[PDB]
Design a protein around this ligand. Structure first.
Ligand SMILES: Nc1ncnc2c1ncn2[C@@H]1O[C@H](COP(=O)(O)OP(=O)(O)OP(=O)(O)O)[C@@H](O)[C@H]1O
Ligand SMILES: [Ca+2]
Length: 360
């Protein structure tokens, strides 16, 4: 029988069967409750009568009651399976606190009675999906961006960096600057419309200053978008100013290095003898890395920071929106992985802290 692959994020949850090339269910990480409980799409649609919670903040689980409700929904409503029948691979953020790993483990075995489980780092799974075991991954989702150096299958914790600027922040920023053109997007249902605008029309400029000058001298960069009621709006320099905040956190009032400088800073924290492997194997993952033009801009910026003789290669896989899930599916499918699982007998004997020596 097949193992199950579950990838829980700040914005979206992805789940399915080990061996498939895509997840079977993708839904919002939202739990709703009367002002008895609703999860996912139903919670968002019925949001008028409900109080909404987001159990995962910047990649870290903060509310365990609600996280359990998401897992019950994932098994019984979305995949339509019995947890006690299947081994279960779960995913976690880089630098997930020790206590969080243990509680995760406790709930699978004691609440859902899984015969087996395992937990792997999100960024490591993405690297695997690209057929590599050495490289540095930039993972940018809905709530957090990480840069993660990896060597022979092992993430290097001393060199991992965290930036709390991602897709959710970009959506809000686009709402703001579209107003300064005369439009008025402010409500929760309007936020969802602007999220669509962002995903369809936005892009990363190669040279920001020059792109600003092009937009100010003609309408060559303008694009249109039709709203539900038939109104057509027009967007110009907003198309590239929005994702520019990833490269300049100043735009949002943050005193922080951009995603290009963060990647270089992580590499510089690693042993001199491995840096060249990392420079030549920089991989992009997550929904927020989907912008057209993002790989060429990363290439340009890293080149200006690195030594002049250095070989720079940015890899941006076409399926990178789901490369965490696909990496898990690959791993849980390998017959040479089957003796890596934590069994329930092992749990019964050692308890939740067995996870530190089994999932290393
Ligand atoms: N084509 C696209 N262009 C730009 N942004 C996109 C695109 N598709 C999705 N996104 C954005 O990516 C985000 C979702 O990505 P992902 O599922 O990787 O994050 P997550 O796992 O929910 O969150 P995190 O990893 O931060 O915990 C959303 O903010 C969404 O608006
Ligand atoms: Ca994620």
């Amino acid at each position: 029988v097949a193992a199950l692959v579950v990838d829980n994020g700040s914005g979206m949850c992805k789940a399915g069967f080990a061996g498939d090339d895509a997840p079977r269910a993708v839904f919002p990480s939202i739990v709703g409750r009367p002002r008895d409980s609703y999860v996912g799409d139903e919670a968002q649609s019925k949001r008028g009568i409900l109080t909404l919670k987001y159990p995962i903040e910047h990649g870290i689980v903060t509310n365990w009651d609600d996280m359990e409700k998401i897992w019950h929904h994932t098994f019984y409503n979305e995949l339509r399976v019995a947890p006690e029948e299947h081994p279960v691979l779960l995913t976690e953020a880089p630098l997930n606190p020790k206590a969080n790993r243990e509680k995760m483990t406790q709930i699978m075995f004691e609440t859902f009675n899984t015969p087996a489980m395992y937990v792997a780092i999100q960024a490591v799974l993405s690297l695997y999906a690209s057929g590599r075991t050495t490289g540095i991954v930039l993972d940018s989702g809905d709530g957090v961006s990480h840069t993660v150096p990896i060597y022979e299958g092992y993430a290097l914790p001393h060199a991992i960096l965290r930036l709390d600027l991602a897709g959710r922040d970009l959506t809000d920023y686009l709402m703001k600057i579209l107003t300064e053109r005369g439009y008025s997007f402010t409500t929760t249902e309007e936020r969802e419309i602007v999220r669509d605008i962002k995903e369809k029309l936005c892009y990363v400029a190669l040279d920001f200053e020059q792109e600003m000058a092009t937009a100010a001298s003609s309408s060559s960069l303008e694009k249109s978008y039709e709203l539900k009621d038939g109104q057509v709006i027009t967007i110009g320099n907003e198309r590239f100013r929005c994702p520019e905040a990833l490269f300049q956190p100043s735009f949002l009032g943050m005193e922080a290095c951009g995603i290009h400088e963060t990647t270089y800073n992580s590499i510089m924290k690693c042993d001199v003898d491995i840096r060249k492997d990392l420079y030549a194997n920089t991989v992009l993952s997550g929904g927020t890395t989907m912008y057209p033009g993002i790989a060429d801009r990363m290439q340009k910026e890293i080149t200006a920071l690195a030594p002049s003789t250095m070989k720079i290669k940015i890899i941006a896989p076409p399926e990178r929106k789901y490369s965490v899930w696909i990496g898990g599916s690959i791993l849980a499918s390998l017959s040479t992985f089957q003796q890596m699982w934590i069994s329930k007998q092992e749990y019964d004997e050692s308890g939740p802290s067995i996870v530190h020596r089994k999932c290393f």
